[PDB]
Amino acid sequence: LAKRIDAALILKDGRVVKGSNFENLRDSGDPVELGKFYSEIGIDELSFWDITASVEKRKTMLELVEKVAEQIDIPITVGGGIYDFETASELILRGADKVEINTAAVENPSLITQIAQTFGSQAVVVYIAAKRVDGEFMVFTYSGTKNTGILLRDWVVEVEKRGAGEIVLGSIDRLGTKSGYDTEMIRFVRPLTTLPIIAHRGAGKTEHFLEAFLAGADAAKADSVFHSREIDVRELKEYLKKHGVNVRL
C-alpha cells in the first residue's frame, strides 16, 4: 500500500540512451551504476527497457540482468521486445524480479498466463500504451506505432483475467511532454481493475506525482525527468510525504 516511485532506464547496447547529468558518477551512461545510485537515494523499483534492435539483443539483456542482480537490492523489472515464455523465463532465472511485456501480450495474451503459471502473477508486468482516437482510449503496440483497434477498457479487464500482476499505463498523448501525467486516463482505468496501476509519461514537476496518486495510481514511473535532475528523488519523496501521501522514506 505505500505509494511507489519508480525509475526507468532506456537502454541500447547496454548503454543508457542519452545518459544522465549525474556529474558525480564514474560513467554517466552505465546502467548498473546509475541504477545503484538511484537505489541509494531512494527509488523504490527500477525498470530496464531495452530498445536494442540487433542480433545481439538477447545475449546483451541477460548479461546486464546478471550484473544488476549482483549490485542492486530493490525490485528489478526488464522489458522491451520480450516475445515468448522462454525469453521471459531466462530473464527471471538470471535475476529479474519481473518481466514486462506489451506487443507480445496483445498479440498472444496466453503469454501472460504462461509466465504467471510458473512464476506467479507478481512476476508479470503488462505495459499498456494507450492514446485517444476519435473519443476512445485505444491500445497501441510496436513502440506506440500500431493502432491495434483494441479498446483500453477491454484490454485492462483481459490482462487481469489472464494473470498479470500490475499494469504500467503509458499515455502516448504525454510522450516527451512535461505537463503532467494523464490523470484522466488513470481515472478511466482505476475502477476497471484491482491491479496496481503504474502511471507513466508526462511528469515534469513534483506536483505532477501528487496529481497521479490522487487519480488512483499505485506507483509513478519516470525516466528523463530524473536523469536530467529536473526532479530530485529525495526532494520528491519529502514533498509527497509533506502533503499526506504514503511514500517509503
Residue numbers in the entry: 2 to 250
Sentences reproduced from the published study:
Catalytically essential residues from the initial design include a base (Glu101) that facilitates C−H bond cleavage, an H-bond donor (Lys222) to stabilize the phenoxide intermediate, and a π-stacking residue (Trp50), which was designed to stabilize the transition state and favor substrate binding through interactions with the aromatic ring of the substrate. This initial KE07 design (Round 1; R1) catalyzes the cleavage of 5-nitrobenzisoxazole, with 103-fold rate acceleration over the noncatalyzed reaction and a turnover rate (kcat) of 0.018 s−1.
The mutations in R7 and R7-2 (Phe77Ile, Phe229Ser, Ile102Phe) result in further optimization of activation energy. For R7 and R7-2, we were able to capture the active site in configuration A when glycerol/Bis-Tris was used as cryoprotectant, and configuration B with the neighboring hexahistidine tag bound and MPD used as cryoprotectant. For example, Ile102Phe results in phenylalanine filling a hydrophobic cavity and a small adjustment of the main chain, which increases the distance between Glu101 and Trp50, allowing sampling of the Trp50 rotamer, which is then stabilized by an H-bond to Glu101, thereby stabilizing this alternative configuration. By R7 and R7-2, configuration C (which was the only state we saw associated with product in the crystal structures) becomes the dominant substate sampled, with configurations A and B sampled only rarely.
